[PDB]
C-alpha cells in the first residue's frame, strides 16, 4: 500500500526476470518441442475419436437438407 | 384494440392463447430463434421471454384446459412447459423422446397425447401424460408418401375429437386423415395442388377446412348419417378468393356468429362462414385500418411526416419535393411520431425510449439535430400531440401525462374493474 | 491367435497405464467477456494477463507479477517416454493387423457353403450364402 | 420393465434391426451378454443392442454401467426373440455388440444409426 | 519431481523428468482411482484432464478461478465422484466441498470416498430441489456445474441464487451435444452465456478445452444479486 | 465389481498365472479357475467337469 | 425493550434520563441495553462513566461502540480505567490502540503479576508505531 | 416483529428478525445485509433441536425432504402461536402443509440467504466447523439411507 | 467516401476483436432486450420461405 517503486520497481523487475528464467529453464525445449507436440497431438488424435464426431455432425446436418 | 409492433430481427411465426377460466389471458409467440415470448395483457409488452432448453422453436400448441404448452424445436426435440399460476410463471417439466427430423406442428388430443408433424415426411405421436408410467415417449410413427425426386415435409397437423381422427396436410397437398387409435390412415385426398399450411374445424367435427399455398380454401364434410356411421368425409366444396397464398386460417362458432378467417403472404384478410362456406357470403377486409397512425401533416412549410417502423420520412408540398429521412436504428421499434406547431421539434416514439429532433429548414431540405432530454428518453411513451412549440405532452403506459422540454406531472384519475 | 490378442491387450494396458501418467499439451480456444467499447478498443493487454510478457504463450499454469516476484536430458528422457508410447501404439496397430488376418483364417473354416467372390482390388473378398444357423 | 431406460420405437427399432441384420450378414457382430461385455472391455464394439424382455432384466442391465463408463451407445429393443432372429441364430438373444472395421460395407449406415442412438442418449 | 504452485493453492505442477499436474492429499496412502503418487515425504495426486473436466480447465487457466483453499465449494456436477476428490485436495480441511448427485450408480462410490475423506459432504437428492436439501448446506462460497441434462443454466441459476452468496462465483462446463446437437459450438455457447447474463451472472470467460474433450466449453461468472 | 464381468472370467477367476503362462508359451489353457472347488464340478467326473 | 427500540428509532432520528438508562443497562437484553447506552453516549460524563463499569463486568459490535465511546472521550485517567477494565488480548489490543504509558504499565503489571507472555507481547508488534512502543516501554 | 423458521442441523430455528411483517419481506436487501447489521436485526429466539441421534435425524429428514409433519416441529409450532404473528416459512413445497395450521405464515428467499449466511457466526452460538461436522455427519448418516436402500 | 464510410461503419458495429491470443465480447441492453425481446434465426426462416418459394412449383 505504499507504492514506492523508485528502486523497488527495478528490484522487483530483476527478481521477476531471474525467477521467470529459473522457472522456465526446467520446463521444455523449443528445438525438439515441435516434434514432442506433434507426437502428443498424434497420440491425442488416436485416443480421441472426434473424427467420428465430425462425421456425426455431418450425418446430423444432412438430415435437415430437404433434398432440393 | 391493440397493435404490439416489433422492429427488425424478429418475427411471429406462431402464437397461442391461454385463458384459464376466471383469470387473465396470456398469449405466447415464437421468435425465429429458440425463445418463446409470453406477452402480457396489462399493457401489451412482454412479461416473459422464456428460453426452452433445446433446438430452435418452430411451432407451439396449447394443451387442453390450457395448462401445458408443447414447444417443437429444430434438432428434433419437443419440449413441454407447464403453466402453474398463470402470468409470468413457467416451468418446463419434460423433454419428450428425441428424433432427428425437425418438428413442424403440434396438437393435443386432450391432456393426454401430443401429435407432431415432422420434417422427414412423417407424423409422430407422443404420449404426454402424467399419472402414467409411459410419458415423454412416442407411441406411433405414421409415414406420408414422398415425391419421386423430392423430399416432402408435412406442414400442418390437427386433431378431430369426435370422429377420433387426425388431419394432416403436407408439402404434396395430400390431405390425409389418420385414425387415432390403431395409428392407421383412414382417407386421403390429393385435391390441393401445392403445399398445405393450415386447417381447422368446428365443435363436433362436422367439417374441416383446409388451405395452403394454392390460395384455395376448401371443405370436407362429415355431416350426414351415412358419413357419421361409416365415418366418411367428402370433398364437398372448394373456393379460391385470394391473391398469393394462405399461411394461416382459424375458425370460430357461436350462437351469434359462425365464421372463419384466413390470411396469407398477401397482406389481406378474408372472412367466410363455416356452415355456409359454399352457400353464404364473402367478406374481404382492407389491407390497413389505421387505428395506428403512420402519417401526420403540418401546415407550416406545407409538409408531411410518414413514419415506418424504426424509420421516418418527411417531405413538402410544392407539386412536391422530397426533403429528408431518418432511419434511427437506435430506435428499435416505432410508435407515434409528431411534429410541433411552427415546424420546429419532432418526437419519434418507442414504448420506453422516445427521441426528439429539432428540424431546421435550411432551404430546399431540412437539417436535423438531436436533443436529449433524459426524462423523455426513459419514460414510457405512447402518444404526443403538441399544444405548444417548446413543451411536449407525454402519454404513459402507466396511465400518466407529462409536460417536458424546457429546462412536469398531469395526474389522471382512478379506474374501476 | 490366442496369444496374439492377449499380448495385444498386455501392451494396450501398458499404453493406457503410460497415458494415465503422461501429460498432454493444451490448445482449446479462449474468450474473455467484456462490457463496453471503452474497455474493448484496447484489447485485454499483457496487464490483463497480469504477467511478464514471455510467460504468456502457455495455456497451462502461469502466474502473475504478484506471485512471480538438469541441462537437457530431462527433455531427452521425456522424448524417450513419448517415443515409447508411440512405438507401443504402432506395434499395437501392426500386431492387430496380423491378428485380424489370423482371425479371418480361423473364421474361414467353420461351416456353410460358398462360391468364391473376388473383387477388382486384388485382396480376396468374402461372400457366402444366407441362412439362419441351425 | 421401468428400469430398461433407453427403449426404442418402431422406426428406430426397425432401422437398428436392419443394420444388425446386415452386420450379421457380413459377420462382424457378437452375440450374447458376456461376449458383449468382452467387447466393451477390449473396446472393439461400436455399440450395443439389448433386449428389454429378459426375465429378470438384471441379467442384462449390468453392461449399461460399464457401457456408459466407456461411453458406448446402447439401446433396448422390446423382444429377445426378435433380435435373435435378427442376429441369425435360432435362439432368444439377450444382447449383441457390433464390432468395427473401417473397410466395412455397412459403415455409413452404422454411423447413421449410432448418431440416431446418441440423439436420445 | 519439483512442485510448482498455481495462483490457487491446491493445484500444482509436478515437473522434471516427467512434467504433469498434481494436487494435494486430504487422504494419505493411495491414489483412490489408480494414478501415480508423486513423493517429495509430501504426497501429490495426478488427475487426468481427460477423465476430469475441471482439470482440463486448469490446462485452460483463468484470470480468477473461484476455487481457493478456504473457499467453500458446491459441486452439482456429473454423478461420478472423481473430480470432487481433487476439489477437496485443492480446498484442504478448512474449506469444504458439497457434492450433490442424484443417480446413485456413482452415489455408492461417492459415499465410499467421502467416508475416508471428511472434506466432502454428499447430498443425494436431485440437482433441482435445493429447497429439499436446504438443511444440509449453508451459504456456499462457490459453485461448479457439470450437469448434462438440458436445463443447465436454469437449474444452476436456481442453485446459485439459493445457496451461493452475494458476489460469489460460478464455474460451469457447458456441453454442446447434451443440450443441443446439430447446432455449432460458439452458437450454443453464446446462447448459454446469453441466458446466464439474462440471469445477471456476469460472465468472465469461456473456453472450449478442445484436445482433452470435444465441444464442451467452460464458462465462469461473477455473481451479482 | 465382479457383477460387471463376463462369465468366461468367472470360469477362470482362480487359475490366473496358469492361464497367463499357458497363453505366454503357445500352450493350452486351464479350465477350472477357482471354481473347481464347487460341489457340482466336483461331482462331475472327467472333462465334462470342465464343461 | 419497547423503550430501547424507540431509542433506536430516536438514534436514527438529557443527562439525567441517560443516567437512569445507564442504570437500566447496569440492571441479550443487557447487551442491547449496553449498546443503547453507548448510542445515548454517541448521540455527557456521569452516564458514560457509569456505563464504563457496566461494560467492564459483562456483542463485538457493542465492543466497537465502546471503541466509539473511547474515541468520543483526564484522558490519561480514563485510559487507565479502560486499560484496567480490558487487562481478552483482542479487546486489550483494540482498546489500547483506541496513555501508552498506562498501556505498557498495565502490560508490565500483567506480565509481572504461564503461557501468556508472547501473547499480548505481540500486541506491541501489532500496534508498532514510530513512538508508541518505545515511549510506552520508557514510561512503564 | 416476526419469527422465522429455518432447519439448520437437526432443528427448527426460530430467528427473530425485528422488522415489519411486510417491509422485511419487501426490501430485504436495502436492509443492509451485513454481519453486525443483520445480526442485530435477526436475533436468536428459539432452536427446537431434538438430539444428535439418528432417530431425531430421521424425524428431521421426514420434516425436510417431505412436508413438515415432525412432532418436534409441532412442539416448536406451539411456542410462538399466540398472536397470529408473521412466522416466515422456509420450504415452498412444504408451504400448504405449513398453512394447514392456525398461524400467519409468510425475496423471502433473500432473507433466508441472509439468515443462512449469519447463522454459524452467532445465531445458535455454535461453531462453524462443528456445524459443518454435524452436517456432513447428517449427510453420511441418513441422507444416503433415506434415498438408497 | 462511400467505401471508406462503409468500412468505418464496419469499424463501429463490430464486437469480438481477435488480437493475438484470443477474442472478446461485448454485452446488450437488458431492459431493452426485455421489452423488445425476440431474436430471429434468419437462416432458418429463410430456408423455410425459400422452400416455400421452391424452384419446382409455379409461383409468379
Short mmCIF file of C-alpha atoms in Angstrom, two decimals, chain H residues 64-139:
data_model
loop_
_atom_site.label_atom_id
_atom_site.label_comp_id
_atom_site.label_asym_id
_atom_site.label_seq_id
_atom_site.Cartn_x
_atom_site.Cartn_y
_atom_site.Cartn_z
CA UNK H 64 -37.32 -31.66 5.42
CA UNK H 65 -37.46 -33.74 2.25
CA UNK H 66 -41.22 -34.25 2.62
CA UNK H 67 -43.83 -31.90 4.06
CA UNK H 68 -43.42 -30.84 7.69
CA UNK H 69 -45.10 -33.36 10.00
CA UNK H 70 -42.48 -33.70 12.75
CA UNK H 71 -43.60 -33.86 16.37
CA UNK H 72 -40.63 -31.66 17.26
CA UNK H 73 -41.86 -29.28 14.54
CA UNK H 74 -45.28 -29.26 16.22
CA UNK H 75 -43.62 -28.58 19.58
CA UNK H 76 -41.79 -25.63 18.02
CA UNK H 77 -45.12 -24.60 16.45
CA UNK H 78 -46.68 -24.42 19.91
CA UNK H 79 -44.05 -21.90 21.07
CA UNK H 80 -44.93 -18.62 19.30
CA UNK H 81 -48.55 -19.27 18.19
CA UNK H 82 -50.46 -16.93 20.48
CA UNK H 83 -50.73 -13.71 18.43
CA UNK H 84 -51.06 -14.79 14.74
CA UNK H 85 -47.66 -13.22 14.12
CA UNK H 86 -45.51 -13.37 10.99
CA UNK H 87 -43.85 -16.80 11.04
CA UNK H 88 -41.65 -16.85 7.94
CA UNK H 89 -41.86 -20.33 6.41
CA UNK H 90 -38.83 -21.89 4.74
CA UNK H 91 -39.81 -24.54 2.20
CA UNK H 92 -42.04 -23.79 -0.78
CA UNK H 93 -43.33 -27.33 -1.27
CA UNK H 94 -43.98 -27.65 2.48
CA UNK H 95 -45.94 -24.40 2.39
CA UNK H 96 -49.51 -25.70 2.07
CA UNK H 97 -48.77 -28.16 4.88
CA UNK H 98 -47.36 -25.18 6.78
CA UNK H 99 -50.53 -23.18 6.07
CA UNK H 100 -52.69 -26.05 7.37
CA UNK H 101 -52.35 -24.73 10.94
CA UNK H 102 -53.75 -21.77 12.90
CA UNK H 103 -50.93 -19.32 12.24
CA UNK H 104 -49.94 -16.40 10.00
CA UNK H 105 -47.26 -17.89 7.76
CA UNK H 106 -45.40 -15.95 5.08
CA UNK H 107 -37.16 -12.12 -1.69
CA UNK H 108 -38.11 -14.17 1.35
CA UNK H 109 -35.58 -16.40 -0.36
CA UNK H 110 -33.18 -13.49 0.15
CA UNK H 111 -33.97 -13.15 3.86
CA UNK H 112 -33.27 -16.87 4.10
CA UNK H 113 -29.98 -16.22 2.28
CA UNK H 114 -29.16 -13.64 4.96
CA UNK H 115 -30.27 -15.94 7.81
CA UNK H 116 -28.13 -18.72 6.33
CA UNK H 117 -25.05 -16.53 5.96
CA UNK H 118 -25.26 -15.25 9.54
CA UNK H 119 -26.34 -18.50 11.21
CA UNK H 120 -22.93 -20.05 12.07
CA UNK H 121 -21.39 -16.80 13.36
CA UNK H 122 -23.75 -16.17 16.26
CA UNK H 123 -27.34 -17.32 15.78
CA UNK H 124 -27.17 -20.63 17.65
CA UNK H 125 -23.81 -19.60 19.10
CA UNK H 126 -22.29 -22.84 17.80
CA UNK H 127 -19.09 -23.40 15.86
CA UNK H 128 -18.51 -23.15 12.12
CA UNK H 129 -16.51 -26.37 12.00
CA UNK H 130 -18.95 -28.11 14.36
CA UNK H 131 -21.93 -27.12 12.20
CA UNK H 132 -20.14 -28.44 9.11
CA UNK H 133 -19.22 -31.61 11.02
CA UNK H 134 -22.84 -32.15 12.10
CA UNK H 135 -23.98 -31.50 8.53
CA UNK H 136 -21.55 -33.98 6.98
CA UNK H 137 -22.46 -36.43 9.71
CA UNK H 138 -26.13 -36.00 8.85
CA UNK H 139 -25.42 -36.45 5.13
#
